[PDB]
Amino acid sequence: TDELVWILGKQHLLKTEKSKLLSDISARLWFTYRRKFSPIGGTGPSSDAGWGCMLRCGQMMLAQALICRHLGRDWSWEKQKEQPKEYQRILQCFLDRKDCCYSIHQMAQMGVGEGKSIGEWFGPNTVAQVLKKLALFDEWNSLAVYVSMDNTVVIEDIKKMCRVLPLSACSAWKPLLLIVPLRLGINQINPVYVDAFKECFKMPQSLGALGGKPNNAYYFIGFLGDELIFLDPHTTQTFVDTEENGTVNDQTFHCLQSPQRMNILNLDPSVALGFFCKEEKDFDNWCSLVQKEILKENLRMFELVQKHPSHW
Template sequence: MNSVSPTAVQYGSPEASRRTLGHKNPSSRNDQTKMGSEGASRDGEADEVDKIKSKLLTAWNNVKYGWTVKMKTHFSSTMPLYLLGELYNFRFDDDIERFQKDFVSRIWMTYRKDFPALEGTLLTTDCGWGCMIRSGQMLLAQGLLVHLLSRDWFWPNALYTHLVDMEPIRSSSPSNTLNYPVPSSTKYPQERSRSVWHTLPHQRIVQYPHQEQIHRDILRWLSDHPASPFGLHHMVSLGGSMGKKAGDWYGPSIVAHIMRKALDRASQVPELSVYVSQDCTVYRGDVEQLLGEDPPSDGSVVGRAVIVLVPVRLGGEAFNPVYKHCVKEFLRMQSCLGIIGGKPKHSLYFIGYQDNNLLYLDPHYCQPYIDTSKDEFPLEVNVDEQESVCALVIFDSE
């Protein structure tokens, strides 16, 4: 997918239209006023052209990517599946149900349209250029869910949400993204993860009112509104100090630093920080320093935590197969928050794998803007499951 930059728009003003070289006279002033009116007319035409281009791009984008939303995903019933550190074996019916609950509970961020215009522009959509920012938002959303609600939380309405049909069968996908043999010892681990899910699989159906409020707060913080601390408007604004503007394509390293700045400035979660590694190196002392800062004084039971972002390049023009095993090992970690990246100018949010196929959330489907300022706004999203980088992300807490 090619990056799309907005057409430059010249903003005319009465003062600017009256500027001349040399002396002024009534006739020249009238001529300038006429020229200013013509300039404003041209600007208005350019604005309309931009709006038409935006609508056409959104329509084409949804034709290009919309079919994946309704596609049927095939899973193997003989191979384990890992989703952000959680193990699922589709030999067991309860594992299939637990996986559906888990997957639907992830927050899916996509292109949006018709939101308030980004500052200094007429753009009301990020279609065509905002996929890396959306991937970063999904990653950050997962960190907020783990920090404020725990990895064992799930959305109670997950069982009643329309999920694309899944047909557990033997692996037959044409996409063999991770062509790396799974050792026989890992096919059916003898012990499952000792989380609340596995010991009390039905207990998670109950959600307390404060949990629902936290869930809604997280969605509000990520909404496409200038006041949202982790919304697109604020992310783009922070990118300005790094030479980026609305309409540019953002790389994973830039987005990692934008997320760090956003969390540093967010008063909503003062106990959560982001650490971005330099040259693929994580310095333990720096992370421990972030964890060792004074806890919040408001009596909150939530301790300090750090999201560790590691921007890396796993190959040259294409993914280097030597890293396949490392990617799998990373996605099996309990502290894993996922991987953002993909092909140049085409970002995805990778959250798991089965056999040699990656599981990811695709941000490229464009959906209408949702006003989260209302008390009751829709929580349901049409999730996109696909079989198939980058920034590796780890969640570390006290």
């Protein structure tokens, strides 16, 4: 009994800290299928039920990065009455209306640019590219988004992406959303990658992972033993819009159900790991952890290199 549980870089004891575990999971922003929103593109869907689940999981990963950026990993929506202004502003980016930058509308529209019709389910690499492009429109957050190719993360490319020239004749660092799409096996996850996969969830920078079969996408946030813990978008809820006072009710955006688990060995092999590095020191620390916990394996789950691989 009382196994150690990991959720997004934070540890909880199963029995003695069950309440802390549960509140940490319910404090994450939860995005499910919605219905009765304005038809996407005018004549498109008014509900993403049945097709939108990977977009929903992308939203949950991005929101977690945003929550951490402004409010920190230890923040919770239940611990105080007067919410920081940033919370409501973050949440409202994900409302189901075209004028919100990370809405189902904008994500589905951006998918078209990746050659996916509005209404198509698509996998983790595609949603990673969708997130990268949508971030270009968010001046408030002004995120760098790095999506690895060929299982390889390049240090110098990231630093170039994140370092911003001084305005006046100090270099700033753009907070980094780092996504690593991976294929962990042909049909099932190869046991050789299990420990390294688990290690990812133990890193303070961890935003978990995107995964699942087509039309069964889940947002994986941690693990206990050989089971992954995930948030599930497969509940259709009515569109919730802002009130007259400019705020939106957050009730339906937090999951208070019993946490859901699945065996890692049942997970579809196509995943995308997510990490958030607020400052250069965070990315440097992430590199150290990867070097220690990931690169030590003979069959490496992904690669971390200093210089951009030179092409023939």
